[PDB]
Structure 1
Amino acid sequence: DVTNAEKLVYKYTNIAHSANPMYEAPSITDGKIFFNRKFKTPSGKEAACASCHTNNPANVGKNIVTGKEIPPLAPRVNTKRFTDIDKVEDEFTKHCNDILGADCSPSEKANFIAYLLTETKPTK
């Protein structure tokens, strides 16, 4: 595990750098607000990455669609996550297109992947 996680980082980082020579590496201090910033959707409705994945992804989320239960999202915390890359290399763009209404920035992904592959301490 991680092999992919690390790849993504080294991936989304390259792409970004390929777009903005300024961006070279990610951080673990940006993957918070962006995931805790009550943003508005193009479908007239506010939401947040912490609306389902809670303020903390490593924690137990909850879908506001069915209201079942979304176990820890932390793809790193869980050994049964972030396995495939091909697929994952889309489900992330399709998501932002169904969350924000478009494809998230390449520098916003490597960021999340970082914080996701960084924080591994849940509350309870």
Structure 2
Amino acid sequence: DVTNAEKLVYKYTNIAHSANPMYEAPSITDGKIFFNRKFKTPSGKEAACASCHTNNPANVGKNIVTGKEIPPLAPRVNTKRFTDIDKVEDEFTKHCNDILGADCSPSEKANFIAYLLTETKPTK
């Protein structure tokens, strides 16, 4: 839910600030850029988080590999997101590894979850 998501932003901010002292607080601008940024897959094809989750994380997504819909990421819209707090940190680490080849950094996670807190309305 939103409660657990918000608490994770503080957790990852404090980890990030220890590792990278110039980082002090989340940037929702940077979280949004991270979500939409086209990165290069090994093949040379570009992809972004938004390729599967759409450019609005309040919307239902679609996996470009399998065609399967994906529930929204924004926890105000899909309140199940982040409720499974014993597992969701490990699951996010696994997912970053799957999509990008390595875990997302603590500042990337703080910025991204803070951005998710701000996306409360689906695109119509």
TM over 0.5: yes
Q: Is the 8 A contact 1:40 1:100 kept in 2?
A: no
Residues 44-72 of structure 1: per-residue CA shift (max 9 Å, x gap): 54311011001111112101122121132
- Bigger mean CA offset, 50-59 vs 22-31: 22-31
Q: Distance in 1 between matches of 2:14 and 2:86?
A: 17
How far the C-alpha of 1:75 sits from its partner, in A, is 2.5
Residues 10-54 of structure 1: per-residue CA shift (max 9 Å, x gap): 100010011112212102211222111110134654311011001
Q: Distance in 1 between matches of 2:102 and 2:38?
A: 17
* Counterparts in 2 of 1:43 and 1:11: CA distance versus 1, 3 Å: farther
Relative contact order (alpha carbons < 8 A, sep ≥ 6): 1 or 2 greater?
A: 2
TM-score of the superposed pair, with normalisation by structure 2: 0.90
Q: Distance in 2 between matches of 1:7 and 1:108?
A: 15
Please list every run of 5 or more consecutive structure 1 residues that lacks an aligned counterpart in the other structure: none
- Bigger mean CA offset, 3-12 vs 75-84: 75-84
Please list every run of 5 or more consecutive structure 2 residues that lacks an aligned counterpart in the other structure: none
**Which protein has the bigger helix share?**
2
Q: Is the 8 A contact 2:71 2:78 kept in 1?
A: no
Q: What is the 5 A alignment of 1:1-124?
A: 1-42=1-42, 45-124=45-124
- Bigger mean CA offset, 93-102 vs 65-74: 65-74
Q: Is the 8 A contact 1:13 1:107 kept in 2?
A: yes
Q: Is the 8 A contact 2:59 2:123 kept in 1?
A: yes
Q: Distance in 2 between matches of 1:3 and 1:13?
A: 16
Q: Is the 8 A contact 2:58 2:120 kept in 1?
A: yes
- Bigger mean CA offset, 83-92 vs 39-48: 39-48
